[PDB]
Symmetry: C2
Subunit: 281 residues, 2 copies
């Protein structure tokens, strides 16, 4: 039995999810080879289609860019985003998408815990009614987020709010770490930040992501995808990773990435903690 | 014949580049804007080819331009400036103008409370604080902790040793993550590896402690101009001489902070510093 090749992308979450997939297969007698954090998406995409890697975590919404359906409204539906990625990748590359994680790692807005807790903010619908009724918010975001029609203007019309120039801080780059640091330290009075759902800084900075309940943004749920050649030679991989990824909700993955990105803990040790505490190891 | 003002791609290049541009514009010297052209090797290729005329350079970087990387003279501010000034004049007829006192080098920054509480302003004070059983856990990269030129060299010069209990080792060399770890006190963090004038230091409530024995090479920013351009407008030296002498470490930190985390445009922050200091109004 050839060792299964576990890979991931270069981001912090790739290391966490890749070591989670890697540690689970090793615990059930499946021999593996380590290719974690290989590179960007195009590098991992050409590697799996060529047989150099076998299994790695991919996001459902990224299939919009692999198969030339970038702006389709179907990617805004979490369930429809999974089956279309699952069906297209099986037909085109014989890659099998396993059970996805509930975490939606897409563009969104995170607010400080005090602002969300004191005003009972859990969704972006609450966000729209809170500021439309004169609530104080200063959102730190990139000019790209504020100006591009698919981001803040799309959020504003769907949730019925408009931010005045006094309530905006536009940063030069698109790095979400800077917006998170602005709201965490309240630079220029900021209390909200442009984020990705499971960014490593959100939990250690005391921020809460507000749910895009009307689904303005495309859904990006991480899911392990495996080549069919590898999966049927040892088929237990599907069922073993099924409940593991089912308990990786937005909050759990936020804390695991934070323990790696800012806590300094190795992704392998953070992965083994999550699995033993949840009874998978 | 417009003087081409440029800079490097980071936040300080934009601030220092916009400072050079407005001081020249306010004194009747027409200029061309090439600010934030690229990284150091790209800007080194532009001025050596005559495509740009003036940009802010750091004294210690001449060690890498002239293959004298580890020479002890770069740990002396005076000898590092005069050697950088003379080598570049002999090799490319580039004239180094009056430098800034700010030392944008590798260092350790602490939270204001621990600095205030224990009267920490330099690394010699820092070393005896650890030698006396002090409370410190440092966020740094693995390279900073292990490489002989970084933490072991600080430990030898300032007489202290940090236990594994007092270290947080991060994967990358980006100082924003170490600063964010100490800013939120992740894993109890209260110190961070930094560069002297990093944009996150001031908005995160951090104080960099002085490298009083000069373990690290000194990187002082200075305007450098082609001799051909300077001889047609020779007043540029006297105009930028008192401006850069007013750019100490804390002044450059707060200007970078308002750009990188405050969202203010680099040009308006430059015009504010000059008008408040009487160089514009
Ligand atoms: Ca701006
Ligand atoms: Ca570590």
């Amino acid at each position: 039995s050839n060792a299964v090749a576990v890979s991931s992308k270069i981001d912090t979450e790739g290391g966490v999810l890749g070591n989670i997939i890697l540690t689970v297969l090793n615990a059930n007698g499946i021999k593996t080879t380590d290719r974690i954090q290989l590179g960007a998406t195009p590098v991992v995409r050409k590697a799996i289609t060529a047989g150099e890697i076998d299994i790695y975590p991919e996001y459902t919404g990224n299939a919009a860019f692999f198969f030339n359906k970038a702006d389709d409204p179907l990617w805004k539906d979490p369930a429809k985003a999974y089956e279309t990625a699952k069906k297209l990748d099986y037909d085109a590359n014989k890659i099998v998408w396993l059970t996805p994680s509930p975490a939606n790692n897409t563009w969104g807005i995170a607010v400080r815990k005090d602002v969300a807790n004191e005003n009972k903010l859990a969704s972006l619908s609450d966000f729209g009614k809170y500021i439309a009724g004169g609530g104080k918010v200063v959102l730190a975001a990139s000019s790209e987020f504020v100006n591009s029609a698919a981001a803040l203007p799309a959020f504003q019309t769907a949730y019925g709010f408009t931010l005045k120039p006094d309530q905006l801080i536009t940063l030069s780059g698109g790095d979400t770490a800077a917006t998170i640091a602005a709201a965490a330290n309240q630079t220029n009075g900021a209390n909200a930040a442009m984020v990705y759902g499971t960014d490593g800084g959100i939990a250690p900075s005391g921020l809460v992501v507000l749910e895009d309940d009307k689904h303005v943004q495309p859904v990006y749920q991480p899911a392990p995808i495996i080549r069919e050649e590898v999966l049927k030679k040892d088929p237990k991989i599907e069922e073993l990773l099924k409940p593991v990824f089912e308990k990786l909700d937005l909050t759990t993955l936020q804390d695991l990435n934070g323990r790696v990105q800012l806590g300094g803990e190795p992704a392998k040790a953070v992965a083994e903690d999550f699995l033993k505490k949840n009874g998978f190891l």
